[PDB]
Amino acid sequence: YDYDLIVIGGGSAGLACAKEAVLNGARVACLDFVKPTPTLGTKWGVGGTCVNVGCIPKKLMHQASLLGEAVHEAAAYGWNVDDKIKPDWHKLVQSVQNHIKSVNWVTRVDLRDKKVEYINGLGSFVDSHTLLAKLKSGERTITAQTFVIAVGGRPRYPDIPGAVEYGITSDDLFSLDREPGKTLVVGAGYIGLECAGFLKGLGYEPTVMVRSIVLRGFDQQMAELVAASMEERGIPFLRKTVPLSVEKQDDGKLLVKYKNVETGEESEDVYDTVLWAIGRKGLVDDLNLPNAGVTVQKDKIPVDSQEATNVANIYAVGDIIYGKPELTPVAVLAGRLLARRLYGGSTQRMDYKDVATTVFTPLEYACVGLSEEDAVKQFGADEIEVFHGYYKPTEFFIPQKSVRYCYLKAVAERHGDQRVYGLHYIGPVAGEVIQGFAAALKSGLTINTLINTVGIHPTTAEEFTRLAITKRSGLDPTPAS
Amino acid sequence: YDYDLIVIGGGSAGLACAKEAVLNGARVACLDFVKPTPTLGTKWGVGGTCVNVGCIPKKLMHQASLLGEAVHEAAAYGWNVDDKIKPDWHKLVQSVQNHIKSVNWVTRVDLRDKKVEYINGLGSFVDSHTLLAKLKSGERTITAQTFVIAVGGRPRYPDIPGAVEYGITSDDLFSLDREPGKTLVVGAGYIGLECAGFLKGLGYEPTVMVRSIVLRGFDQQMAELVAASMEERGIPFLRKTVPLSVEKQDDGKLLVKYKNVETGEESEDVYDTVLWAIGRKGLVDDLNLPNAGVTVQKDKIPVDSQEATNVANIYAVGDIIYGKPELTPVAVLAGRLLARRLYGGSTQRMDYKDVATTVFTPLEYACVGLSEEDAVKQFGADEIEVFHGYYKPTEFFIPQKSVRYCYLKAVAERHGDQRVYGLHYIGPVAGEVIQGFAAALKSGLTINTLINTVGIHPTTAEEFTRLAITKRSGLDPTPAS
Numbered sequence A, B: 001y002d003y004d005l006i007v008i009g010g011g012s013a014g015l016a017c018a019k020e021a022v023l024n025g026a027r028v029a030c031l032d033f034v035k036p037t038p039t040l041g042t043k044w045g046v047g048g049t050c051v052n053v054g055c056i057p058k059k060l061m062h063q064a065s066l067l068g069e070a071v072h073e074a075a076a077y078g079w080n081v082d083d084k085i086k087p088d089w090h091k092l093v094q095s096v097q098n099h100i101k102s103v104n105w106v107t108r109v110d111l112r113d114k115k116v117e118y119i120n121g122l123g124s125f126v127d128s129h130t131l132l133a134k135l136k137s138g139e140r141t142i143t144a145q146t147f148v149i150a151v152g153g154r155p156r157y158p159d160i161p162g163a164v165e166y167g168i169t170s171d172d173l174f175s176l177d178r179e180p181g182k183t184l185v186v187g188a189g190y191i192g193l194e195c196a197g198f199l200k201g202l203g204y205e206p207t208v209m210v211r212s213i214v215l216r217g218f219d220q221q222m223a224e225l226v227a228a229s230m231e232e233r234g235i236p237f238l239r240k241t242v243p244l245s246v247e248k249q250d251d252g253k254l255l256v257k258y259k260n261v262e263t264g265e266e267s268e269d270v271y272d273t274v275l276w277a278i279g280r281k282g283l284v285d286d287l288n289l290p291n292a293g294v295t296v297q298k299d300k301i302p303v304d305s306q307e308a309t310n311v312a313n314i315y316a317v318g319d320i321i322y323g324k325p326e327l328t329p330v331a332v333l334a335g336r337l338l339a340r341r342l343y344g345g346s347t348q349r350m351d352y353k354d355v356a357t358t359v360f361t362p363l364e365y366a367c368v369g370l371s372e373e374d375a376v377k378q379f380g381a382d383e384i385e386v387f388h389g390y391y392k393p394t395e396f397f398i399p400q401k402s403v404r405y406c407y408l409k410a411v412a413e414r415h416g417d418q419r420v421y422g423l424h425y426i427g428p429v430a431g432e433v434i435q436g437f438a439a440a441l442k443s444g445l446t447i448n449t450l451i452n453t454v455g456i457h458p459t460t461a462e463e464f465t466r467l468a469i470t471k472r473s474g475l476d477p478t479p480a481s
Ligand SMILES: Cc1cc2nc3c(=O)[nH]c(=O)nc-3n(C[C@H](O)[C@H](O)[C@H](O)COP(=O)(O)OP(=O)(O)OC[C@H]3O[C@@H](n4cnc5c(N)ncnc54)[C@H](O)[C@@H]3O)c2cc1C
Pocket: A008, A009, A010, A011, A012, A013, A014, A031, A032, A033, A034, A035, A047, A048, A049, A050, A053, A054, A055, A056, A058, A121, A122, A123, A124, A150, A151, A152, A153, A170, A191, A283, A286, A287, A317, A318, A319, A320, A326, A327, A328, A329, A331, B456, B457, B458
C-alpha cells in the first residue's frame, strides 16, 4: 500500500526496526502512542519503556542510592564527610526526568533526520495489509505492505478492591509527585526487587511481598542470596503472601490487608505507598488482531524463528513475543536484524540463547547461561560441575562492608571439554563483570580457558578466573580468608 | 640437600610456588627479606611487593580518590552533601597500612599452617645446590635440591645529585609520614600515572614529567587519551623532560632543576615532594648468581618456556624474569604452575600471551591483546580492522561529567574469521569490563560473536557489543549522541 513497512510501536524494538528498514531503502512509518496510567494519568514521550519508565530511570535511581553509600564509605578513607545526609526525592525525580526529556527530543529529531515517519497515534488492524491509525485529532489513516508489531506491554494490576485507585506501578514511580515514604512492593521479580532496593537506599522503608518464590526463572540459590542480601540491609520480606485489598483511610495513610497462602493468616499493615510489580501484560487487546487473522497465545504473540506471525506478511518483535527474554537489547537487535532480512538481503536470524542479564539490586546480581538447577535437570547431576566461591572486594575492607553475600559460581560440563553452561555473580558492578563473560560463553568458554585466563589484579572480575573449589568436593568455598 | 625446594623471595611468585610445592609432597623452604629504603628506611612484612607496596595500597588510594568524586556527584542526584570536603592523609595512610598489616599476619599464619618454612633472611648462592641464608641474628644456613628465584625488583633512582636523599619512590609513598603536598612525579609509566592520578584526587598538586612518551609498551592512541584525560582533571605534564638535580633549600621546599631533551631548555621549579617512578631493577646483585653459574641479561634473568635457567636445577619466576609481563597474577600463576610441574606430575606451562592489564588512572584504561600499531606492524594495515567509538556512561549524565575521553576500540583481523587481536577501553571500572573479554579472546573471540553478544543494558561494558564504526570507514565514532 502506502508503505513498504508500518511499525506498530515506537519502543526499543519498534524504533530499531524502523531506523534499520529506512537504512535499506524502505518507505516506512512508525506509530507510537502512550496511554496514560489509570489514576495519576502519567504519560511520557517517544522511545518506549526503557528510556521513559524502565532501564534508564531505574539505573539512575540505583546510581543515586549507590552514591549515598559512597558518601558513607568515604569517611573510612579519611574524608571529613558529614554523617546525616538525605536525598531530595523531588530533586532526584527532576534530574531523572530532565535527562529523559532531553533523550525524547533527540530521539524525535533523529527519527525525522533518518526519514522515519513517526505517527503519534494508536494503530489497530482493519485487514492484513490495512491499519487504522488513530491520531490525537481523532484523525485516522490507513494501509501498508508489511507489518511489524512491537507494542510491548504495560504493568499488571491485581483484581482486588482499591488496586488501580490507591496503588501505583513502575510507570508512576519514576516521576512520582508525592514522596514514596513507607512503601509496600508487591512482586519479587527484578522490578520489585530493584525498586525496593533503591527505595531503602534513598531513605524510605520498603517491604517486599512474595506470593511464592524470589526471582522466578533465575537460579534459586542466587535468588535467595539476593533476598538475604536485602534483609541484611534492612528490607523485610513477607513470604508466601498475597494482597487482599487496599483502602484509603481518613488519615492519608494506606491500609493493606493481606493473607498467607500456605497458612491462612489474614493480617494488615499501613503504608504511604503501594507498588504493584506483579508482571506485565502484552498490549494485544488494542490491536484487533482477529481483523488481521493473527493468533495470540494469551496476552502474547507467538512467532517463528524469523519473528513471523501465522500471517506471512505480519511480524512481531520485543516484549509481545511469546516466551522470549523481555529485555531492551534483545528487542533492539531482533528488530534491527528483522529490518535487515526484509530489506538488506540478510539471512541472519536472532540468537535468543545465553542472553546475559543484571538485577540492579543493592548488591547487583548478573548471570548468563544456565542456572544450576536447569543444567542438572538437562544433563544429570553427575555430568555437572559447579565451581564456586565467596570473595572479598578490595574496596570493601576499609569501610568494613559485609562480604556475606559476595558469591560467585560457574555451572559447567563435568568431563571432556568442560564447557561452561552458566556464570552467576553477586557483587559490585555485576553487569560490568558478566558482559565480557557472556561473550566468552558465546565463543565456547571452557573451565580450562576460564581458569588459565590471567586475572586483572585487584578487581572482583578476576574472581571468576580464580574459581577452583567445586561443590562436589564439599570443601569450604571461603579460601584462606 | 636439606630441602627438596628452596624458594628465594616471598612475594607473589615465591609464595605461590612455595605453597603449591608443599601441596604436592615437597619439603620446601621460602626465604624473604625486605631491605629498608635508602633515607626514610621504610620496611614492611612478608607477602612481597603487591600486598605491601604495590597493587593493594595503590588500589586503596585510587578508591579513596574515586570516593571523593562520588561525594561531589551525589549532590547532582539530590543528596544534601557539603561541597568543601578534604581527606586526611594520615588517616588514609593509617587505614591502608592497617589492612596491609592484617594481611601480613594472616599470610604468616597461612604459611606456617601449610608447613612452608619461612626464613626471614637474605639468600645468596654458594653453589648450584647450596645457598647461604643470612638471618637477622647475623646467623646463616645452607643447602637444597632445587631452586626457585622469585626475588623481583626495587624502584630505580636517577644517577643525579640529591636523588636518593630528597626524592621518594612508590615504596615510601604508601606509608608517607609527611603530607605529599605539591609533588613532582618523574615517570609516565603506569606507576607514575596512577600516583599522580590519586594525588590530584586527594587534594594535592602533582606534575608528571615525561622523558619521551606516555605509557611505553601500550597503545599510543590510548596512552595519549589517558594523558589528555589527566590534563582535563588539572594534572600538568612536562613533555620531553629529564630531571637534572634536586636540592633541599633552607625553606623545607624542594627545588628541582630540569631540562628539555629535544630543545635544551634548562628550567626549575619548587615542590614539596619528588616521586621517582622511573622503572624497577631486578634484585640479581645480592644473589651472587656466578656462584651458581646462572646467566643474567642485565638486572634480569632469562628463562626458557619452563622457567628454567641455564642451570637445569635452578629456576626463576615473576619480575626478575627477562622480558615477560611484570604483574602479580602472572607471577602467582607461573609460580604455581612451576611447583605443579616439579612435584605434581603436570605438563602445563605458563601462557604469557593476551595477559590483560589495567592502568588505574582517574579514568581507568584496561586492555588485552595487541595495540593497534603492533597489529598493523604484524599483519599489515589492509588486513587489520579497527572498530571504535566514543560512548556515554549512564551515570555521567546527571552530574554532567566529561565524556571526552570515554573511548573504546577493538583491533581485529579484517577478513575471514575476523579474529579479535586486541581490546582497549578508557572509562569507569575498566578492569571489571575487560577481564571477561580477556577470557573471550582466549576462547577465540571474533567480531561476529562480539557484535552478536547481546548487551546488558544499561552498562558501559555493553559498549563493546555495540561497536560498529570502523576507522577505515572514516565515519564519526560518536554515534547519534
Ligand atoms: C521498570 C522496568 C525496568 C526495566 N529494566 C531493564 C533493564 O535494566 N535492562 C533491560 O534490558 N530491560 C529492562 N526493562 C525491560 C525493557 O524496558 C523492555 O524489554 C523493552 O522496553 C521492550 O521493548 P519493546 O519495543 O518491545 O516495547 P516498548 O519499549 O514498551 O515499546 C512499545 C511502545 O508501543 C506503544 N504501543 C502499544 N500499542 C500501540 C498501538 N496499538 N499503536 C501505537 N503504539 C502502541 C507502547 O505504548 C510503547 O510506547 C525494564 C522494564 C521495566 C518496566
